[PDB]
Amino acid sequence: MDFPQQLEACVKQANQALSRFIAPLPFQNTPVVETMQYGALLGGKRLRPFLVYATGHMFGVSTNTLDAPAAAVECIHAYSLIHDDLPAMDDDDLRRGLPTCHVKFGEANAILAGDALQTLAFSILSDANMPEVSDRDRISMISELASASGIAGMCGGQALDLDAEGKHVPLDALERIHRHKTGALIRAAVRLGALSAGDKGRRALPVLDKYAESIGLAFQVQDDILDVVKSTYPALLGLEQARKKARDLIDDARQALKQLAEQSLDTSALEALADYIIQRN
Amino acid sequence: DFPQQLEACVKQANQALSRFIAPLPFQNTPVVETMQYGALLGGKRLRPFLVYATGHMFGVSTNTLDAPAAAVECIHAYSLIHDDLPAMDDDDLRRGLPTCHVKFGEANAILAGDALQTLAFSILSDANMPEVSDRDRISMISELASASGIAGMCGGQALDLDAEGKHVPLDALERIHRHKTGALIRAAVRLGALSAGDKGRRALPVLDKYAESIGLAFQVQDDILDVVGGKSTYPALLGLEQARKKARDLIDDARQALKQLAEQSLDTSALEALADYIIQRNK
Numbered sequence: 001m002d003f004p005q006q007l008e009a010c011v012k013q014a015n016q017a018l019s020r021f022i023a024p025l026p027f028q029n030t031p032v033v034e035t036m037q038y039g040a041l042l043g044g045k046r047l048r049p050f051l052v053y054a055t056g057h058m059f060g061v062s063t064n065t066l067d068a069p070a071a072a073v074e075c076i077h078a079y080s081l082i083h084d085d086l087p088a089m090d091d092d093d094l095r096r097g098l099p100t101c102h103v104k105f106g107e108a109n110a111i112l113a114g115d116a117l118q119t120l121a122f123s124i125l126s127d128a129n130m131p132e133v134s135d136r137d138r139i140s141m142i143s144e145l146a147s148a149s150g151i152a153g154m155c156g157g158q159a160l161d162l163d164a165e166g167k168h169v170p171l172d173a174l175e176r177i178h179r180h181k182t183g184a185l186i187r188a189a190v191r192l193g194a195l196s197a198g199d200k201g202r203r204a205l206p207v208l209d210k211y212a213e214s215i216g217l218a219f220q221v222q223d224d225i226l227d228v229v230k231s232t233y234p235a236l237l238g239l240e241q242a243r244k245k246a247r248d249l250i251d252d253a254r255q256a257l258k259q260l261a262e263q264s265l266d267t268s269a270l271e272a273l274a275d276y277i278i279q280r281n
Numbered sequence: 282d283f284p285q286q287l288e289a290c291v292k293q294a295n296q297a298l299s300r301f302i303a304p305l306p307f308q309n310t311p312v313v314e315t316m317q318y319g320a321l322l323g324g325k326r327l328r329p330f331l332v333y334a335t336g337h338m339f340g341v342s343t344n345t346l347d348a349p350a351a352a353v354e355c356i357h358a359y360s361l362i363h364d365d366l367p368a369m370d371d372d373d374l375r376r377g378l379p380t381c382h383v384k385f386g387e388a389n390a391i392l393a394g395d396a397l398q399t400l401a402f403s404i405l406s407d408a409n410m411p412e413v414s415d416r417d418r419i420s421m422i423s424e425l426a427s428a429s430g431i432a433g434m435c436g437g438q439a440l441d442l443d444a445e446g447k448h449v450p451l452d453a454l455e456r457i458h459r460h461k462t463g464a465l466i467r468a469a470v471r472l473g474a475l476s477a478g479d480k481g482r483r484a485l486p487v488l489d490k491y492a493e494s495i496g497l498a499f500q501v502q503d504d505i506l507d508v509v510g511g512k513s514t515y516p517a518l519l520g521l522e523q524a525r526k527k528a529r530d531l532i533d534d535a536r537q538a539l540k541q542l543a544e545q546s547l548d549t550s551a552l553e554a555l556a557d558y559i560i561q562r563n564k
């Protein structure tokens with residue numbers, strides 16, 4: 001199967017995993033729970049779950065066990081978008097070809113839905129059945145998701161980003177904003193997949209981190225290029241050197257995978273992802 | 282002496298809170314300045330009091346209890362920052378001072394509340410709790426999450442909104458409170474007990490009774506004090522004096538639940554003083 005079919009397949013897996021935890025929730029007939037479902041399940045590429053699944057599978061972890069961190073990272077991802085769309089934030093009327101949550105359900109419902117999705121990520125990690133995941137590793141997973149999603153990571157990146165409005169920050173500052181705003185949660189997806197496998201996965205982390213941060217930045221560069229085809233990669237470097245940048249970052253990602261392949265790990269899915277990113281634009 | 286124990290637990294909870302907020306990165310950013318303003322300035326710290334009092338009953342150290350005390354207060358703090366927003370309760374003032382969104386703008390207030398919720402989970406998974414088991418630590422995280430999310434606090438805030446000016450009946454009103462404020466108050470007690478482990482876990486059945494009783498009693502008493510100190514309240518549905526009776530009956534339950542524990546060599550004096558304080562407050 002081609003990567004487009006793989007993405008379709010993961011989207012369906014990520015979607016099941018998501019609904020398996022969302023459907024048993026109380027208050028289903030309320031605007032807020034309806035907003036949570038709209039905001040979490042309708043559209044999206046599910047790249048964070050993909051990373052959890054792909055990384056976990058390399059270490060021989062079942063899809064059942066991985067459904068948990070895959071849904072949990074997507075819950076953090078979904079909540080951030082709901083809050084980021086708010087008029088006080090990015091103020092978006094449309095997302096995923098659909099009116100954003102605050103437009104459809106109202107700001108209060110959007111605020112609460114986002115708040116509750118964050119919490120659900122932690123309930124999932126602390127409650128989901130993961131038969132071969134030790135208690136120590138589960139705490140590492142929770143700890144990782146929390147530092148990556150909070151002020152040290154995602155929130156902290158969003159803070160920096162709003163502060164950078166109208167400041168035309170240099171490339172190094174820009175990459176720092178991205179590393180925290182999106183890099184941290186993408187690194188978390190990979191880290192949760194490997195922690196899932198225990199000590200074996202825990203040893204591949206320094207290399208997996210390099211892969212994750214590199215593809216995290218490569219995604220942002222491609223997004224920026226797609227926008228033209230605040231500071232952005234193209235605005236700072238010019239189109240050609242932004243394309244070069246994405247190519248450089250994917251090379252960095254492949255070097256990381258090279259180290260994993262040398263440890264007899266199947267990097268095919270992670271390699272397929274680097275391939276998909278660089279063929280973009 | 283109890284009003285002095287409260288001031289003592291407040292200064293302590295604040296220390297705990299600062300312990301976990303101060304070393305965070307980006308200290309010189311509006312968002313972080315907002316988390317500090319919202320978490321630390323003003324408040325009675327009753328949830329932390331519940332954590333400290335329940336834990337101390339089992340001889341758990343304060344240094345250890347600083348974690349669950351700070352974590353529950355972060356959840357509480359974040360809920361107020363978000364609830365104060367114009368789209369929600371729309372409050373310009375709180376604790377006698379401008380609210381977060383008024384002082385720092387909505388964007389910051391939104392982000393700071395989000396980051397405080399995350400911090401609660403970073404505290405429970407990272408804090409040094411030398412005597413706390415991994416299975417218990419996990420139970421402490423699971424509990425905070427269930428109590429704070431759609432099944433607890435957020436779900437209560439929703440029920441409360443979806444009921445905007447609907448004159449809900451008594452059962453619906455109690456359901457709103459049970460989730461909106463009861464769950465987190467019970468979580469405070471449940472976390473204090475969990476840190477102790479086995480001894481604490483066996484006390485939960487009775488501790489929950491105490492927690493649920495005082496949780497509702499706080500709300501009934503708030504309603505009473507709003508009257509003598511449309512949306513449904515206890516005096517509006519029951520009558521002022523029937524609301525007082527209701528609060529009094531709740532504290533009785535709380536005292537009885539505690540007897541059962543004091544009947545197992547547990548010093549319930551602090552939890553007793555709190556139950557008495559609830560029903561006795563005049564402002």
Ligand SMILES: CC(C)CCOP(=O)(O)OP(=O)(O)O
Pocket residue numbers: 045046047048182219
């Ligand atoms: C483009 C956009 C505003 C949506 C943000 O999410 P994202 O593009 O980081 O999500 P993925 O790159 O993981 O698909």
Ligand SMILES: CC(C)CCOP(=O)(O)OP(=O)(O)O
Pocket residue numbers: 325326327328462499503564
């Ligand atoms: C004044 C008053 C007791 C009402 C404040 O209620 P709150 O929920 O903000 O805090 P408590 O639960 O500690 O009372």
